[PDB]
Design a protein around this motif. Structure first.
Motif, PDB file in Angstrom:
ATOM      1  N   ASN A 140      -7.426   9.845 -14.345  1.00  0.00           N
ATOM      2  CA  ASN A 140      -7.862   8.649 -13.944  1.00  0.00           C
ATOM      3  C   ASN A 140      -7.696   7.325 -14.173  1.00  0.00           C
ATOM      4  O   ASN A 140      -7.410   6.432 -13.384  1.00  0.00           O
ATOM      5  CB  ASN A 140      -9.318   8.749 -13.702  1.00  0.00           C
TER       6      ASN A 140
ATOM      7  N   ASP B 242      -9.007   2.231 -20.123  1.00  0.00           N
ATOM      8  CA  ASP B 242      -7.636   1.522 -19.761  1.00  0.00           C
ATOM      9  C   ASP B 242      -7.960   0.068 -19.421  1.00  0.00           C
ATOM     10  O   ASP B 242      -9.004  -0.470 -19.570  1.00  0.00           O
ATOM     11  CB  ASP B 242      -7.567   2.329 -18.426  1.00  0.00           C
TER      12      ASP B 242
ATOM     13  N   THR C   2     -14.072   8.974  -3.350  1.00  0.00           N
ATOM     14  CA  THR C   2     -12.655   8.746  -3.606  1.00  0.00           C
ATOM     15  C   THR C   2     -12.134   7.545  -3.069  1.00  0.00           C
ATOM     16  O   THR C   2     -12.793   7.261  -2.014  1.00  0.00           O
ATOM     17  CB  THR C   2     -11.583   9.856  -3.307  1.00  0.00           C
ATOM     18  N   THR C   3     -11.246   6.800  -3.719  1.00  0.00           N
ATOM     19  CA  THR C   3     -10.544   5.711  -3.208  1.00  0.00           C
ATOM     20  C   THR C   3      -9.245   5.889  -2.791  1.00  0.00           C
ATOM     21  O   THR C   3      -8.479   5.069  -2.239  1.00  0.00           O
ATOM     22  CB  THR C   3     -10.630   4.359  -4.173  1.00  0.00           C
TER      23      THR C   3
ATOM     24  N   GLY D 259     -11.634  14.279  -4.765  1.00  0.00           N
ATOM     25  CA  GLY D 259     -12.660  13.569  -5.190  1.00  0.00           C
ATOM     26  C   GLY D 259     -13.967  14.265  -6.071  1.00  0.00           C
ATOM     27  O   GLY D 259     -14.948  13.863  -5.984  1.00  0.00           O
TER      28      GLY D 259
ATOM     29  N   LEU E 157     -14.628  13.475 -11.427  1.00  0.00           N
ATOM     30  CA  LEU E 157     -15.869  12.775 -11.819  1.00  0.00           C
ATOM     31  C   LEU E 157     -17.075  13.315 -11.873  1.00  0.00           C
ATOM     32  O   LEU E 157     -17.763  13.668 -12.798  1.00  0.00           O
ATOM     33  CB  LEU E 157     -15.901  11.422 -11.825  1.00  0.00           C
TER      34      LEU E 157
HETATM   35  N1  LIG Z   1     -10.582   4.458 -14.704  1.00  0.00           N
HETATM   36  C1  LIG Z   1     -10.924   4.014 -13.523  1.00  0.00           C
HETATM   37  N2  LIG Z   1     -10.647   2.953 -13.251  1.00  0.00           N
HETATM   38  C2  LIG Z   1     -10.924   2.362 -11.881  1.00  0.00           C
HETATM   39  N3  LIG Z   1     -11.621   3.277 -10.962  1.00  0.00           N
HETATM   40  C3  LIG Z   1     -11.744   4.532 -11.176  1.00  0.00           C
HETATM   41  C4  LIG Z   1     -11.477   5.085 -12.598  1.00  0.00           C
HETATM   42  N4  LIG Z   1     -11.865   6.460 -12.565  1.00  0.00           N
HETATM   43  C5  LIG Z   1     -12.369   6.641 -11.445  1.00  0.00           C
HETATM   44  N5  LIG Z   1     -12.316   5.487 -10.630  1.00  0.00           N
HETATM   45  C6  LIG Z   1     -12.823   5.523  -9.199  1.00  0.00           C
HETATM   46  O1  LIG Z   1     -13.665   6.876  -9.199  1.00  0.00           O
HETATM   47  C7  LIG Z   1     -13.076   7.390  -8.179  1.00  0.00           C
HETATM   48  C8  LIG Z   1     -13.291   8.983  -8.272  1.00  0.00           C
HETATM   49  O2  LIG Z   1     -12.806   9.380  -9.300  1.00  0.00           O
HETATM   50  P1  LIG Z   1     -12.361  10.867  -9.327  1.00  0.00           P
HETATM   51  O3  LIG Z   1     -13.736  11.795  -9.144  1.00  0.00           O
HETATM   52  O4  LIG Z   1     -11.695  11.593 -10.563  1.00  0.00           O
HETATM   53  O5  LIG Z   1     -11.639  11.448  -7.795  1.00  0.00           O
HETATM   54  P2  LIG Z   1     -10.327  10.983  -7.547  1.00  0.00           P
HETATM   55  O6  LIG Z   1      -9.462  10.464  -8.704  1.00  0.00           O
HETATM   56  O7  LIG Z   1     -10.186   9.951  -6.535  1.00  0.00           O
HETATM   57  N6  LIG Z   1      -9.395  12.454  -6.731  1.00  0.00           N
HETATM   58  P3  LIG Z   1      -9.176  13.655  -7.981  1.00  0.00           P
HETATM   59  O8  LIG Z   1      -9.671  13.420  -9.427  1.00  0.00           O
HETATM   60  O9  LIG Z   1      -7.893  14.143  -7.664  1.00  0.00           O
HETATM   61  O10 LIG Z   1     -10.012  14.757  -7.371  1.00  0.00           O
HETATM   62  C9  LIG Z   1     -11.552   7.125  -8.228  1.00  0.00           C
HETATM   63  O11 LIG Z   1     -10.864   7.359  -6.665  1.00  0.00           O
HETATM   64  C10 LIG Z   1     -11.449   5.712  -8.458  1.00  0.00           C
HETATM   65  O12 LIG Z   1     -11.918   4.931  -7.157  1.00  0.00           O
END
Ligand SMILES: Nc1ncnc2c1ncn2[C@@H]1O[C@H](COP(=O)(O)OP(=O)(O)NP(=O)(O)O)[C@@H](O)[C@H]1O
Ligand SMILES: Nc1nc2c(ncn2[C@@H]2O[C@@H]3COP(=O)(O)O[C@H]4[C@@H](O)[C@H](n5cnc6c(=O)[nH]c(N)nc65)O[C@@H]4COP(=O)(O)O[C@H]3[C@H]2O)c(=O)[nH]1
Ligand SMILES: [Mg+2]
Length: 177
Positions: free
Chosen positions: A57, A102, A121-122, A130, A133
């Motif tokens: 992430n 970060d 997710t974005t 998504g 996390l």
């Molecule tokens: N370090 C970060 N900085 C900014 N935004 C973040 C960060 N970590 C997570 N996010 C936001 O939180 C969302 C959800 O993260 P996550 O649950 O890991 O899903 P994802 O990264 O979009 N896809 P995936 O992890 O492949 O399943 C991301 O798409 C970002 O929009």
């Protein structure tokens, strides 16, 4: 669940090598290992998954810097007061700390409340699920831990995991029921 007693320093330092392979030079990955690191009781592969999901992430967030973005993995023994200060309100003594930080764009305040939601997710439809996390959150709670997110636009994002210190010398907790 295969809980074991883990040295926090060994856990991260050994995993760091594998993580650097996964990240390549997409980011400058830095560390900060505190002194006198505690032991914890957790499922090793689950904690590795949680750290990995946070690290990717962070990489995603700083992609636009094209090699210049910085991701830090920090470990420490925190005092009770430090843990409260860093966002663990119920800290009751020395606390184990793992933080993935970060210098990316940070998390918009309108997004912050839903980042742990399954499927939020974005990213565009073809990339990821998504769940990253949601999985992290679940792992932290399964490890009897707490997770706090510190992030504002122009302030990067820091994902802070607080875990109980395991002390092998501690007397068995017990009661007469
Ligand atoms: N370090 C970060 N900085 C900014 N935004 C973040 C960060 N970590 C997570 N996010 C936001 O939180 C969302 C959800 O993260 P996550 O649950 O890991 O899903 P994802 O990264 O979009 N896809 P995936 O992890 O492949 O399943 C991301 O798409 C970002 O929009
Ligand atoms: N059956 C079932 N029960 C579930 C599930 N997920 C959560 N629960 C239960 O639901 C309660 C409420 O969860 P919440 O709304 O997230 O409300 C949470 C949340 O707002 C907050 N919280 C807990 N842990 C963390 C954390 O690590 N970080 C942050 N930022 N907040 C936390 O504290 C509140 C209370 O947490 P708990 O005492 O754990 O109380 C939890 C827990 O008992 C599930 O999948 N199935
Ligand atoms: Mg992700």
């Amino acid at each position: 669940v295969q809980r074991e007693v883990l040295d926090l320093g060994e856990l991260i330092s050994e995993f760091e090598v594998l993580l650097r392979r996964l990240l390549r030079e997409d980011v400058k990955l830095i560390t900060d290992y505190g002194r006198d690191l505690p032991q914890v009781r957790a499922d090793k592969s689950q904690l590795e998954t949680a750290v990995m999901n946070l690290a990717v992430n962070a990489r995603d967030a700083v992609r636009a810097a094209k090699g210049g973005g910085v991701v830090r993995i920090r470990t420490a023994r925190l005092t009770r007061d430090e843990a409260i200060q860093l966002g663990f309100p119920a800290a009751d003594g020395d606390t184990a700390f793992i933080e993935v930080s970060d210098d990316g764009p940070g998390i918009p305040p309108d997004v912050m409340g839903k980042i742990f939601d399954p499927f939020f997710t974005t990213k565009p439809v073809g990339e990821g699920t998504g769940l990253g996390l949601a999985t992290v959150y679940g792992i932290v709670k399964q490890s009897d831990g707490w997770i706090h997110v510190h992030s504002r636009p122009n302030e990067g994002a820091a994902f802070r995991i607080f875990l109980p210190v395991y002390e092998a010398p501690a007397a068995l907790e017990h009661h007469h029921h």
